[PDB]
Amino acid sequence: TPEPRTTRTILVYMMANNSLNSFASKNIESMIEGATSKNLNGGNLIVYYAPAGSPPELLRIKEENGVVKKIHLKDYEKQNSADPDVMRSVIGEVVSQYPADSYGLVLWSHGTAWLPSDYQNKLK
């Protein structure tokens, strides 16, 4: 049951099962303040949220009756959000249900460029 194709779908993929946990919520609230019907301009704002103390969830952010709401799309079971297979699958679910003429991805987490995650062991 896909939504009608729109001009743009943006997915925010939030890997927050780490020290940024507390800040993920603040960033989502910022998105809620900005995501009015006028500002979304017909587009879809979808958020994959993977926090520390609970399983991931897929959310749509959209204004209804003058209030921008976080709409619960689904709850995932515990899963490794840093597994490329999981990322591909989430992206696929989102693109399939929220087709658009153009797509944007916001990748939200810790980052260290190309560095190996175990770089501290490669310094000597």
Binding site: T7, R8, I10, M15, N17, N18, L20, F23, K26, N27, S30, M31, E33, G34, A35, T36, K38, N39, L40, N41, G42, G43, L45, A50, N80, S81, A82, D83, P84, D85, V86, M87, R88, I91, G92, V95, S102, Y103, G104, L105, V106, L107, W108, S109, H110, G111, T112, A113, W114, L115, P116, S117, Y119, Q120, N121, K122, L123, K124
Partner: protein
């Protein structure tokens, strides 16, 4: 690496595997250190544009409220979104932010310009460089300094002609960039000046980091693309 889920991370090649080819118009990294020439090259077929920071970003992250109408505008201009981020931090209590916008269609030409400089360079040539002559852009815990300003490194190795070609290609690839006067680094608890800035970092191989170079050779596509 990008993306921490408990103990698990995505290495830059794993991230490329997690992304479909030629679907996204843009990828915006709300994450430290992702405006790395190597990372943009690894992801060159995953988006038309990469909007990211070459240094660390404050925990509050990008200004989603203000950016929202720009991100969804009919006439999407990612340079505007980058400017909204920069202008937000410029006026913040912690005015520490770097941003760049990379046009991925221009990365193959940039790769060629860099290949033509680095492919004949030896360990002796590279290890002769004094890191103190280049802008350091990374201060991870226990790091001796691995990521430097891309322009600064290349300027040390290129002939004048090579350098002119590089700058022409660089300007086609990095279409927008901005930096606050200083950038803040969590591990040192301090902000340090940015004296030279092109928008992208590069690994500077150093004689004290042979294991890091071995990993970079095996796992970062840029290495084989420009050093071989």
């Amino acid at each position: 690496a990008f993306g921490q889920d408990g103990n698990n991370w995505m290495e830059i090649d794993d991230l490329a595997k997690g992304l479909p080819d030629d679907l996204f118009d843009f990828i915006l990294f709300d994450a430290c250190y992702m405006a790395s020439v190597e990372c943009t090259y690894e992801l060159r077929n995953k988006a038309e544009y990469i909007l990211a920071s070459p240094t660390e970003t404050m925990a509050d992250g990008w200004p989603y409220e203000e950016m929202m109408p720009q991100l969804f505008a009919t006439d999407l201009q990612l340079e505007k979104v980058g400017e909204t981020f920069y202008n937000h931090y410029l006026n913040n209590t912690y005015p520490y932010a770097t941003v760049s916008l990379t046009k991925t269609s221009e990365l193959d030409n940039l790769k060629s310009a860099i290949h033509d400089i680095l492919a004949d360079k030896t360990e002796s040539d590279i290890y002769s460089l004094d890191p103190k002559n280049m802008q350091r852009l990374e201060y991870l815990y226990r790091s001796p300094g691995m990521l430097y300003d891309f322009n600064d490194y290349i300027k040390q190795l290129a002939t004048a002609e090579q350098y002119d070609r590089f700058i022409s290609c660089l300007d086609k690839a990095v279409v927008y960039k901005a930096h606050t006067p200083k950038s803040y680094y969590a591990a040192i608890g301090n902000a340090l000046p940015i004296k030279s800035y092109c928008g992208l970092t590069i690994f500077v191989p150093q004689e004290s980091l042979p294991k890091m170079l071995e990993w970079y050779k095996q796992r970062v596509g840029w290495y084989k693309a420009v050093y071989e």
